[PDB]
Amino acid sequence: SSISISAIGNVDSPMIRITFQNQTEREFFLNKITDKAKSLGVNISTHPFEIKEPNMVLIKPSKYNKLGCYISKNKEIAINFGRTDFRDFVLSNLGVGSHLGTCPTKNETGNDTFYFHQENLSLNGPALSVNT
């Protein structure tokens, strides 16, 4: 059930690459997040998650498409998830501990977003292994 997570692309169009061990693991995750997003009124019908072969889910770039990956003002890999509960759900189900980044809570600014600490994930840098 181990998962690899990398940040990929360029500064204008950064993405997250999530690699699963097999297609069944990927499908299991996708079913979970689609059901959760629907329950929270978060529209993920075409953005930001996209499947790629083999065994991958990409988180596409945020645009102005508010959801998705962007480079923060502090040069951090950030992901906007629209709603706090959706962010928390996706991170938990990926095995990404909140300690790996800035993860504002409740009513704090950026409560819908996760910001990877620079020392943990960088653009086109090595992958992180989680859920091991």
Strand partners, 5: 18, 128
Resolution of the structure, angstroms: 1.6
Strand ranges (DSSP E) for the chain? 3-9, 14-19, 49-52, 56-59, 68-71, 77-80, 101-102, 113-116, 128-130
Q: Cα(97)–Cα(52) distance, rounded to whole angstroms?
A: 25
Q: Cα(3)–Cα(22) distance, rounded to whole angstroms?
A: 10
Segment (H or E) for 35: helix 23-39
For residue 127, what is the DSSP state?
P
Q: Cα(32)–Cα(60) distance, rounded to whole angstroms?
A: 19
| Contact of 15 with 60, CB cutoff 8 Å | yes
Q: Cα(8)–Cα(106) distance, rounded to whole angstroms?
A: 29
Q: Are strands 49-52 and 68-71 parallel, antiparallel or unpaired?
A: unpaired
Experimental method: X-ray
